[PDB]
Amino acid sequence: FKNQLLLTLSSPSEAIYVRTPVRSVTVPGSEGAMTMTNGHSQTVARLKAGEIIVRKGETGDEVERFFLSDGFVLFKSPEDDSGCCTAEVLGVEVVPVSMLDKESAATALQELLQQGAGATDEWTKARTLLGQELLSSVIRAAP
Amino acid sequence: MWRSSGVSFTRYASEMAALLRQCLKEPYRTQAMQRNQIHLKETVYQQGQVLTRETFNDIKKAFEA
Amino acid sequence: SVKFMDQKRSGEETVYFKKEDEALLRNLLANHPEYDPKYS
Amino acid sequence: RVGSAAQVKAMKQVAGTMKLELAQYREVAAFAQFGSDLDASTRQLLTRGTALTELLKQRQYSPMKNSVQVCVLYCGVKGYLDPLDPKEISRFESLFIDYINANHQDILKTIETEKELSEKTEAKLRAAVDEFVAMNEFKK
Amino acid sequence: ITTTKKGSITSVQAVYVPADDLTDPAPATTFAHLDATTVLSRQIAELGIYPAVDPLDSTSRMLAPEIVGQEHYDTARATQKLLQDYKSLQDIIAILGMDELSEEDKLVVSRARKIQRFLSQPFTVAEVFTGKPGRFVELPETIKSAQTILRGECDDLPEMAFYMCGGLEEVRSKAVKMAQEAA
Amino acid sequence: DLKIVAARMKSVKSIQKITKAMKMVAASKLRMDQRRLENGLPFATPVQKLVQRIPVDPKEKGTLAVLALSSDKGLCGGVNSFVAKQARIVIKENEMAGNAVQVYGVGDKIRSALQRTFGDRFKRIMTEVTRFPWNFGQACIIADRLMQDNPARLMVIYNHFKSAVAYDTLTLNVLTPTQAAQSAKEQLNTFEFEPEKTDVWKDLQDFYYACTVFGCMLDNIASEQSARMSAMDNASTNAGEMISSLTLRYNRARQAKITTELVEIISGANAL
């Protein structure tokens, strides 16, 4: 086909891309953010939160932002006959940034801190901390 | 943080997607919590002779019990 | 076919509304304490 | 077996439509208990059929005139009752009747004299219907 | 047998209906001669609903808004509409099940079933069959209870309590009792 | 008689009508289920294909756990029949070698099918699941229950949805922690794991479990709906046939009644 990057960005409830040809795609790995392009090595990574940023070949400058909660990324080298290199970004809940809110975000953060103030269980403390992480990411990412 | 707390990655992912769904805008948030309600009925057996039956409508109590 | 359908319907309805009546009998006295003789 | 030959044109113009609409309702009646899953172009038929059936309902020893009948069936077939709660149609009808008998006796006399529903009377009718709906409030 | 300007004869005739066939000439000719009608059924008596009156075959010349007020007329017609809807769902329930029915249809079925249970009441003459004591239910009480049941105040109350209850208050008393023995 | 044939015709006509209505309803539900499939399969295929690089031998010895997916409503054709057939086959094959079998299930139909025969092997059952759409009753819960009850080898029986008139029953040999620990996972050395393999494997395996159940049950639901449409077709056809037969019988009995009453009248008129 072409020497592009075939992205598929998918959640269970909606597949946003299937074989979209793009140039570069940034993704928030569990260690830190990183950007996949054509030629990138075969790799697997776990994601933590934040704003995937897609950049089509037709766009170049224009972008598309999507918020991801958690999931995985799988970059597969290009088949010899396809001429094109593929990537799969799986997310348990993938929203756009247009559909996000900072007020309900901060309210949920407040209620999470309220629930976790009675820190007794390990899972409750951990859930409070991880909710703090994700909600801070939502706040920093929303417009 | 979860193999120490005795928690699964699926449980953590679900319980965090719940909070994200709570941080949505109302028109899409309605459809989200709609398409992500819960209704299950677990039924535990031991060589026949049911030990217990219990219903679940919440993710946290479903993963806990 | 006639007694078949009738008895199947009657049994299904009986079971369904037995369950529902059990639930309502559980949750009655809370939401309607003016009848509860515990407070009388 | 006589048919529309025993009908004024003012009634033809609405009955030729209502017959087809009620036939479609009779063709898709059983789907009323499963309409939650169906699509438009099949829920609209159910809605219009229910609205017409509730419009054709009538009270004992309370007959109407042909002008009033034509006005009401125009209000019914022209979609001014689809968005309503059906239980309110008996009110709709009653209020509309009182309104027109208070306000547009000229319309009623014209329909009774010419035995036709011309475009001018139709415009007057749509005007009166819009005025009535604006003056009044219904559930759905 | 008719009222005149000198006196009055209120008559009550029992009409045997052989093989439960109302198309027989004797009942057919007798329906036209009556002011009030009350048709008893086996499909209903099998449910223990006594008196086993079919309210969709029973009629009366008196049931009009001008004689009995609209509180009575509309209540009666709403009851009949509910019962006809429940009868027009029997096959859907027998084939598919309650799982397919919407919550509107579930609420209508529950109300119809509750109404049927409410209608049945014990009789003093039947005490040597049932053992239960007899009841005399006045008409305003009946209209209040039917209006209540149709309005939806008592949908939460269980159907069993409704059964064999002379009055709504009695229904409450039996539901209270059944909840106490439930816990 | 006449009352019998008339009641039968009435009931069967109602049956046919409701059957056609439910046919259309099931077609709509199958459309929406195909939509959920097309949206939710890409979420599962990549990770399943990744972990399937580690080949599982179905001859391994150890505590088997058989997860049988099924429905909760009837009129689904014979899909749950085929599921329970494959499950019986698997159980009778794996209990000969001596592998102790446990049975997990989804739906009341598999329970009713395997109670009398394999009810001494039940472990845990779920039902009232598909009242709503699928991921309402998240597969993550069942996967967590499996991992908490960690068996040595796991099989998953379901119906693959080939097309609107064709399905196929399958069994998935699924990798477990014992089978992962007994392998060095050299096949994944071509892949870079951003967290280390030993720390990310346990979190990847639960995702694999969840995704496996998810797609399998979506396919089973679609196959169920296709079989439901087929069953509605066959039921409406049989109802039409029965209506024809009962109409013939009704007309016969009508003529018989007429002749009998007329002969009675004539003999009572000639017996004077």
Automatic annotation (TrEMBL), chain A:
Q: What GO cellular component entries does it have?
A: mitochondrial inner membrane; proton-transporting ATP synthase complex
Top-rank taxon, per record: Eukaryota
Does Metal-binding appear among the keywords? no
Q: Does the keyword Transit peptide apply?
A: yes
What keywords would UniProt list here?
A: Hydrogen ion transport, Ion transport, Membrane, Mitochondrion, Mitochondrion inner membrane, Transit peptide, Transport
Location in the cell reads: Mitochondrion inner membrane
Q: Name one GO molecular function term.
A: proton-transporting ATP synthase activity, rotational mechanism
State the signal peptide span. Answer: none
ATP synthase F1 complex delta/epsilon subunit N-terminal domain residues: 7-75
Q: Which family does it belong to?
A: Belongs to the ATPase epsilon chain family.
The entry's protein name is Putative ATP synthase
Give the organism, scientific name.
Toxoplasma gondii (strain ATCC 50853 / GT1)
Classification of source organism: Eukaryota, Sar, Alveolata, Apicomplexa, Conoidasida
Automatic annotation (TrEMBL), chain C:
Q: What name goes with this protein?
A: Uncharacterized protein
Shown portion of the complete protein runs from 57 to 96 of 145
Q: Which domain of life does the protein's organism represent?
A: Eukaryota
TrEMBL record, chain D:
Q: Which residues bind ATP?
A: 58, 60
Biological role:
Produces ATP from ADP in the presence of a proton gradient across the membrane.
Protein's organism: Toxoplasma gondii (strain ATCC 50853 / GT1)
Q: Where are the transmembrane segments?
A: none
Question: Which family does the entry's similarity section mention?
Answer: Belongs to the ATPase alpha/beta chains family.
Q: Which residues form the ATP synthase alpha subunit C-terminal domain?
A: 7-114
Localization terms from the record: Membrane
| Stated name of the protein | ATP synthase subunit alpha
Superkingdom to which the source organism belongs = Eukaryota
From TrEMBL, chain E:
| Localization per record | Mitochondrion inner membrane
What top-level branch of life does the organism fall under? Answer: Eukaryota
UniProt binding sites for ADP 2: 50
**So where does ADP 1 get bound?**
50
The protein's role, per its UniProt record: Produces ATP from ADP in the presence of a proton gradient across the membrane.
Its assembly, as annotated, is: F-type ATPases have 2 components, CF(1) - the catalytic core - and CF(0) - the membrane proton channel. CF(1) has five subunits: alpha(3), beta(3), gamma(1), delta(1), epsilon(1). CF(0) has three main subunits: a, b and c.
Name the family the entry cites: Belongs to the ATPase alpha/beta chains family.
Q: What is this protein called?
A: ATP synthase subunit beta
* Species name: Toxoplasma gondii (strain ATCC 50853 / GT1)
